[PDB]
Amino acid sequence: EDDKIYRGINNYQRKGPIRAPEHLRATVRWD
């Protein structure tokens, strides 16, 4: 209960930037 070692910014108490599939190129088309 509030040990004030504080652990970093977001730790005071998978969404957002989602990980790209590493095993994939996006199928590109020339519009």
Partner: protein, 111 residues
């Protein structure tokens, strides 16, 4: 006149503003963070805007009393205006166009 009024029971200059919703907007900001759109919208290629508090929106001829007395034949009179619907889509551009929800068919334009 055909505009249906949801305010048949009041008007402000005799019984007053019976509600002042002002802090709901501020608590919406504090619930979604003060950077609620800056991480999403490209403010960085807007200009070099470091402050984002002096930012101001559409003011140029919004009411448009007498435009210039042209004819306004069919579609430019009664049809909807396309430029707010495209500037709003331009405003949330990296989070209407994000690369990693459907990572399949992408269609780059010419040049």
């Amino acid at each position: 006149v055909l505009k249906q009024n949801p305010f048949w029971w009041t008007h402000q200059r005799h019984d007053g503003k019976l509600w002042n919703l002002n802090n709901y907007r501020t608590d919406m900001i504090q619930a979604l963070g003060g950077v609620e759109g800056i991480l999403e919208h490209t403010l960085f290629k807007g200009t070099y805007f470091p402050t984002w508090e002096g930012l101001f929106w559409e003011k140029a001829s919004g009411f448009e009393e007498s435009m210039k007395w042209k004819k306004l034949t069919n579609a430019q009179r009664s049809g909807l205006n396309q430029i707010p619907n495209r500037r709003f889509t331009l405003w949330w551009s990296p989070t209407i166009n994000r690369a990693n929800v459907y990572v399949g068919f992408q269609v780059q334009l010419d040049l």
